[PDB]
Write a protein that binds this DNA or RNA. Sequence first.
RNA 1: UUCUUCUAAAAAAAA
RNA 2: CAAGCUUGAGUCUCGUAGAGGGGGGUAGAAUUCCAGGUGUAGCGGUGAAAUGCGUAGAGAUCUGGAGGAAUACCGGUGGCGAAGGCGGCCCCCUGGACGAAGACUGACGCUCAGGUGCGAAAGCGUGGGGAGCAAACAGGAUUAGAUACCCUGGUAGUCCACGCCGUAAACGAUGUCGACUUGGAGGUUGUGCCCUUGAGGCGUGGCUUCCGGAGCUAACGCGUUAAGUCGACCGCCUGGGGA
Lengths: 88, 66, 70, 129, 271, 104
Amino acid sequence: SLSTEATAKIVSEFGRDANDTGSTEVQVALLTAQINHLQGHFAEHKKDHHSRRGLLRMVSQRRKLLDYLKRKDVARYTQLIERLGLRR
Amino acid sequence: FCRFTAEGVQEIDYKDIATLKNYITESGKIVPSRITGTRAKYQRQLARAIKRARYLSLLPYTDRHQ
Amino acid sequence: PVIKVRENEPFDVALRRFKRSCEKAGVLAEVRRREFYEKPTTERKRAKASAVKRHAKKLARENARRTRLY
Amino acid sequence: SMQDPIADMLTRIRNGQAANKAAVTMPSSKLKVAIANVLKEEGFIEDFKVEGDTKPELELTLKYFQGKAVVESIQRVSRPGLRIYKRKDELPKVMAGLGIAVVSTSKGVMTDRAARQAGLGGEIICYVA
Amino acid sequence: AVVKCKPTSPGRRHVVKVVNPELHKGKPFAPLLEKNSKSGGRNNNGRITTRHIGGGHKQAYRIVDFKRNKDGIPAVVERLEYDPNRSANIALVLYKDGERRYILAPKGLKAGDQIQSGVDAAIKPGNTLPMRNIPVGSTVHNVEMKPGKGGQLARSAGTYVQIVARDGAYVTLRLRSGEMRKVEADCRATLGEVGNAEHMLRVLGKAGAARWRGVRPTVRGTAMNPVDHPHGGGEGRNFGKHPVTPWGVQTKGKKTRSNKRTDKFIVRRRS
Amino acid sequence: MRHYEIVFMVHPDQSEQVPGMIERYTAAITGAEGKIHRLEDWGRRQLAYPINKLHKAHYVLMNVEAPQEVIDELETTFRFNDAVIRSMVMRTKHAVTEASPMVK
RNA sequence: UUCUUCUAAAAAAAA
RNA sequence: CAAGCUUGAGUCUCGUAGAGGGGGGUAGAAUUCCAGGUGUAGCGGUGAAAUGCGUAGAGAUCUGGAGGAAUACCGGUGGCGAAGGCGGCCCCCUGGACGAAGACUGACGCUCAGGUGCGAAAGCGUGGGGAGCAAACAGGAUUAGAUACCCUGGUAGUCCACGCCGUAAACGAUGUCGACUUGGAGGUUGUGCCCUUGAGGCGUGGCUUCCGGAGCUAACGCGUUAAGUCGACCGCCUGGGGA
């Protein structure tokens, strides 16, 4: 999983109040970070389906959160996908 | 009647051969939990310790291998 | 199961001690178990059946302890 | 997920009556307290009471007559999978008028007989007899 | 990487190429090239001593360092190159003192790696040490047969040998043929297998592909006449005799090794 | 970094080489910004069963905190050192420092 | 330890 | 449609248990083979035999070596996983679940035709590996016959890397999610309080086994892990054979 220091750095960068850890921007950033960190792992271990299931769960969770955000405030969603480099 | 939960030890140390010898038979086999009365968690820890000791040649796998 | 005969000890009691040690260590049962191959489904079903009997006998004894026969 | 709190309320009432419970408790709502008020003024439940501020909990004191329960049949009619709406001239008479049918009209939620007297139909929430 | 060609024409329909993106796409090293003239399978008397050889694309000889005597001087791999003289690829390495040489390419060798020979070299793929200091059980390649002569065993695309035992001045190697052979402990060897392991997976596809490598066609004995081969003759297809070479020696099973000088080093024959 | 408990057994004929081996390994650990939390040479000991047709071995226990990129190459040095007979590198949750039960 | 098979038609009581 | 709220859902801090998954090493027992020492007329197998292995020295026993597969004991109606399934030990990468205190976002939720992924064993392709077991096959028995059950051998296969196939009594013959309804004895895993006055007592969570009340069910049974009382969505059935 992600390190404590990495999560702290991410929540400091994206958190409005620097102590929240639950806002949609922070959660999407954490999921995105974990997915990118797992890119190297699944490139080497292509047969780890049991972990790929968890990865797909993260992906679907992030998709639902991004859909919710885009429905609620288009501006924050646009800024977040620009900062994280997500195509959609 | 588990000795490990009585002393409240955090984890069983594989180097503690003196205590480990009391939970193995003369043939080198592991004595069952239902006989010695050890709690399941400590039983698993004890099994792991016994295997680690066997790998480290501190305990015999069997009584006959020479 | 090593048994070394001690001084001033009869052979028959030594043989009995060796037999007792052997049945304690379970070598005969182990060899008879490994005489032929047992499928994983068969051994699982056998262990399940054994547990069912080992629980049923206890419950049967508990019920029989209450009532009388005459 | 929990997608029908009204059905959940009816189910709690039915189970409590079957299990001989004196009172039942459930999370409140303005519609639940309204149906509870209708049941109390119609003599199906003894009294209702709502406590709490942020998460208000409604408590219904059930009613028993001659050992057995009073409400012997209670069922949701318009459920989220299939809504049922009926005009005032074709309202149903539950148990030949002895039972009642909780119907939600424009002037609040009331019984079927009251709705017929007042001359307006509505959504049929549930039958209770 | 093996790729399967699309069937846009017969002769290409069944081709499977083995592309290697790491190979140098240029000309080979000039101070190490030298002439390699063809022979047609003909000896100094001009007679064909081995049939089905002749033609094929022109090739130049790359002076590969088989002896590997530059001891103690580390070398960095400049680039990998294709070698037409052998099945395996070769690597152009540069020593610290500025001398470039060609070596066989191991399995995991990429550009920029460091290799070294000698008695005190580290144990990692590509280093060359005498096999008495190399741990037992390890798979090595480009192994010598006599001390200082240069590698002769395990030299093709994806071969290797395993050092299975050592007893005094000799070690016992399990050769790629499945045969156990003794060899002196002072012979050098390079750690790890040799690189182009997927070379056997390629299929030539057409007759011309074999013609490009100087391999002339092979005529079956039964298709000839009795004066040409023992198997020749017959009104139709007839083969009523035990299979033999064109000079009358049996092929299906008959052993032909007659070297009593080197029998003492063969611990156990192949299977 | 990560806490490791290393225990290796070396051939009894090399009993005089064990101080020097201890110095080299500790030097590597410290040079790689590591810590040595305990080091107990258990000396020679009788084996429970004969390993490589010899019945005695010199045991050494060492508790280290070091990066895995120095620990793996240490395992390689063990693998290629013919003097050492076995080596168990176990990873522990925290640094433990109490004396092992075979010093008494 | 082995030990196979017997086709094709039945009838049944009603305070 | 707009503004909210924290109970549903999710995130962070500290821990816990686990054969959860992928990659690479390593340890021991045993089977088979090879070489040698001792030793002689049987071994192996069966209900009884015979094929087979033995005077060219087998079987037995000891030593050394090669190779492959699987991890006794622990081991448990025990644990983990969505299911298939996962069992020596060590390291690297990694998924999920649960507990105690808070803090945070604020319905972001549940199900899902078509679609996508995972999916035992057997089987297929390419390249390895092959000790034991063992479809096909051969020989020996039993029998009226024996293309079988039993015996001696034995090839694909079982093992490794990457793809294909996508099927099982793939079973709890019980789709997923949520709410409510008497209880008892355990197993396993956290955690709070009282004097841990020893392995004591009193709660409160997760998973799981057996018995049983109301209720349901054609009955057998299910019975807070429902097949009880309800709500949301999906797939499926309309006599047997044909199929």
